[PDB]
Design an enzyme around this catalytic site. Structure first.
Site, mmCIF file in Angstrom:
data_model
loop_
_atom_site.group_PDB
_atom_site.id
_atom_site.type_symbol
_atom_site.label_atom_id
_atom_site.label_comp_id
_atom_site.label_asym_id
_atom_site.label_seq_id
_atom_site.Cartn_x
_atom_site.Cartn_y
_atom_site.Cartn_z
ATOM 1 N N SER B 9 0.805 -1.216 0.000
ATOM 2 C CA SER B 9 0.000 0.000 0.000
ATOM 3 C C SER B 9 0.843 1.274 0.000
ATOM 4 O O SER B 9 0.346 2.314 -0.429
ATOM 5 C CB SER B 9 -0.945 0.026 1.208
ATOM 6 O OG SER B 9 -0.218 -0.129 2.413
ATOM 7 N N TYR B 40 -4.528 1.091 3.586
ATOM 8 C CA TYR B 40 -5.604 0.161 3.278
ATOM 9 C C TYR B 40 -6.295 -0.360 4.528
ATOM 10 O O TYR B 40 -7.500 -0.665 4.490
ATOM 11 C CB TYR B 40 -5.054 -1.037 2.510
ATOM 12 C CG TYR B 40 -4.582 -0.786 1.099
ATOM 13 C CD1 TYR B 40 -4.528 0.501 0.543
ATOM 14 C CD2 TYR B 40 -4.188 -1.861 0.316
ATOM 15 C CE1 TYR B 40 -4.090 0.685 -0.770
ATOM 16 C CE2 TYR B 40 -3.764 -1.692 -0.974
ATOM 17 C CZ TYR B 40 -3.708 -0.430 -1.516
ATOM 18 O OH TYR B 40 -3.269 -0.315 -2.814
ATOM 19 N N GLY B 41 -5.580 -0.431 5.651
ATOM 20 C CA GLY B 41 -6.074 -1.214 6.781
ATOM 21 C C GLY B 41 -7.296 -0.653 7.481
ATOM 22 O O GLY B 41 -7.959 -1.386 8.224
ATOM 23 N N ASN B 72 0.241 -6.901 4.452
ATOM 24 C CA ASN B 72 -0.567 -7.900 5.147
ATOM 25 C C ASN B 72 -2.057 -7.678 4.918
ATOM 26 O O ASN B 72 -2.841 -8.645 4.913
ATOM 27 C CB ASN B 72 -0.275 -7.882 6.652
ATOM 28 C CG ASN B 72 1.176 -8.166 6.959
ATOM 29 O OD1 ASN B 72 2.031 -7.321 6.691
ATOM 30 N ND2 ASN B 72 1.476 -9.358 7.529
ATOM 31 N N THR B 73 -2.475 -6.420 4.766
ATOM 32 C CA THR B 73 -3.893 -6.145 4.569
ATOM 33 C C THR B 73 -4.346 -6.659 3.209
ATOM 34 O O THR B 73 -5.375 -7.336 3.100
ATOM 35 C CB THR B 73 -4.182 -4.644 4.695
ATOM 36 O OG1 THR B 73 -3.892 -4.188 6.030
ATOM 37 C CG2 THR B 73 -5.667 -4.365 4.380
ATOM 38 N N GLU B 151 4.833 5.782 10.721
ATOM 39 C CA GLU B 151 5.105 6.616 9.554
ATOM 40 C C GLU B 151 5.569 8.013 9.944
ATOM 41 O O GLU B 151 6.251 8.668 9.147
ATOM 42 C CB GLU B 151 3.867 6.703 8.658
ATOM 43 C CG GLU B 151 3.373 5.351 8.154
ATOM 44 C CD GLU B 151 2.522 5.448 6.884
ATOM 45 O OE1 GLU B 151 2.024 6.571 6.578
ATOM 46 O OE2 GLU B 151 2.351 4.427 6.178
ATOM 47 N N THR B 183 3.067 -4.620 7.868
ATOM 48 C CA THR B 183 4.385 -4.227 7.354
ATOM 49 C C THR B 183 5.130 -3.292 8.295
ATOM 50 O O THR B 183 6.373 -3.276 8.306
ATOM 51 C CB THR B 183 4.241 -3.472 6.024
ATOM 52 O OG1 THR B 183 3.232 -2.463 6.153
ATOM 53 C CG2 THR B 183 3.891 -4.384 4.871
HETATM 54 N N1 LIG Z 1 0.770 -2.299 4.576
HETATM 55 C C1 LIG Z 1 -0.322 -2.400 5.541
HETATM 56 C C2 LIG Z 1 -0.225 -1.328 6.620
HETATM 57 C C3 LIG Z 1 -0.573 0.057 6.103
HETATM 58 C C4 LIG Z 1 -1.977 0.103 5.523
HETATM 59 O O1 LIG Z 1 -2.935 0.014 6.313
HETATM 60 O O2 LIG Z 1 -2.098 0.150 4.281
HETATM 61 C C5 LIG Z 1 -0.274 -3.782 6.174
HETATM 62 O O3 LIG Z 1 0.751 -4.462 6.107
HETATM 63 O O4 LIG Z 1 -1.266 -4.188 6.757
#
Ligand SMILES: N[C@H](CCC(=O)O)C(=O)O
Ligand SMILES: Cc1ccc(-c2cnc(-c3ccccc3C(=O)Nc3c(C)n(C)n(-c4ccccc4)c3=O)o2)cc1
Ligand SMILES: N[C@H](CCC(=O)O)C(=O)O
Lengths: 249, 247
Positions: B9, B40-41, B72-73, B151, B183
């Protein structure tokens, strides 16, 4: 009189609250770009393009006026949207400058602008204020207020520690604080509580609320006449609409 | 050797890219972060699934032989749909962590705590996969605010400690294993270890499962240098982050 209201997500409900209490419009089409929120952590090129795409959404709704409730979009994309729109577009920065001209007569009064990173980086508030002769302007990006407020964290240790984190490095105690972000009115009392309790102030600094400022402006341009409200979103529309009641309380 | 893609993301996927670069697995890596639309989450499954499909369109002209979904999302919500509509193999970061737990956690009653975004936790992707492997003692916790804190580079101090206290105090189980199911969370792994170690008089820290190291281990069991950086937001902003996350 049918108008549109544009925000990155649910924060714009703080402006909608003011617009509803103004009894100025018959129909309001609210659109939050909740699939892509937040805007304030992103870059000017991206935000400008978001604003242009927002005009596309409202085309089929035949609105007479578009309110950009988002302070970030107002700071980065408003000029671009105005160039490509046939209908008028009002953002939330310029009406706030007029409210400061009415309520803050001392041009040396210390003014503190709070906003997203993108809003603060643009200097939109500083530039407009300097154009009106204000000489004592400080600015502070308080990024984490946005996700805190969206989790409904409106008091307690986490909010207070976050507030301390941003406000401790302040060198000038403000007489005026501009809430230059849709979300910040929900912690207005806590912000003023922080300054009274940490600087032993008699009263609190004066807070400028973007929705009240844009209402004052719009009333000077439209006659006095409960409007019909539609909610639309780029993410799940029920996730967006079901939060309206809590913001418009 | 293989030219591959890494999708995230935004910049969090650099925790996975770091592991991949350390292991020297692939000749060429095309990294794409959807930094215009992150996070995204906090969003809904329909939105995330469509984001995942759109990422596939990005990689088409790059002729990749494998796509790693570092997010992961997206792994939790969009991987099945992505694999349906893609001709090239796609590997996410959830299943390799299940394999890592199977190797590293022989006690099926060991208390496992899954940390992730709101969407990852709501999907029950981790719980379902772990239950299918016979694990009997699984807890989960969405820790949404860790993402914006990390972040902003809040990796220590009172604000991070208060945020950890906020999420962890209601926990009823003392975990033996913690899955860093996001992540961003490797960047506070030592602080999470220190939270449980202090607050609970542990002689040793819980075992933390790192998605990036788990997927490296998995890819080595299947497939026994150039990097390019692409972004939907400003690419120099993403590159500036890459330098900091990959150091
Ligand atoms: N990359 C997202 C974390 C940031 C997001 O919510 O997009 C994850 O690993 O869940
Ligand atoms: C008088 C009236 C008319 C129609 C509806 C209606 C229609 N579908 C919903 C709905 C569906 C799912 C989830 C939430 C809601 C919801 O309630 N949506 C809200 C609306 C439309 N309005 C106008 N408000 C508001 C505005 C100001 C202050 C307080 C509440 C809402 O909250 O509701 C509610 C009331
Ligand atoms: N609406 C934004 C706050 C949330 C975001 O960053 O998009 C603003 O008023 O600045």
């Amino acid at each position: 009189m049918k108008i549109g209201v544009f925000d990155s997500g649910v924060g714009g409900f703080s402006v909608l609250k003011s617009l509803l209490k103004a009894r100025l419009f018959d129909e309001i089409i609210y659109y939050g770009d909740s699939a892509r929120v937040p805007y304030g952590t992103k870059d000017p090129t991206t935000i400008k393009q978001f604003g242009l795409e927002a005009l596309d959404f409202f085309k089929p709704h035949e609105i007479e006026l578009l309110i950009v409730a988002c302070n970030t979009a107002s700071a980065l994309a408003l000029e671009e949207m105005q160039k490509y729109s046939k209908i008028p577009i009002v953002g939330v920065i310029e009406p706030s400058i007029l409210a400061i001209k009415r309520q803050v007569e001392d041009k040396n009064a210390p003014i503190l602008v709070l906003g997203t990173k993108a809003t603060i980086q643009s200097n939109a508030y500083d530039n407009a204020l300097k154009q009106q002769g204000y000489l004592n302007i400080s600015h502070l990006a308080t990024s984490l207020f946005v996700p805190l407020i969206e989790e409904s964290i409106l008091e307690g240790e986490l909010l207070e520690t976050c507030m301390h984190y941003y406000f401790t490095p302040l060198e000038i105690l403000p007489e005026v604080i501009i809430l230059g972000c849709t979300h910040f009115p929900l912690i207005a009392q806590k912000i003023e509580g922080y300054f009274m309790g940490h600087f032993a102030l008699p009263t609190p600094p004066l807070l400028i609320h973007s929705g009240d400022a844009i209402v004052e402006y719009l009333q000077q341009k439209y006659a006095l006449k409960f409007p019909k409200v539609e909610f639309h979103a780029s993410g799940d529309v029920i996730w967006l609409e079901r939060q309206a009641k809590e913001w418009l309380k």
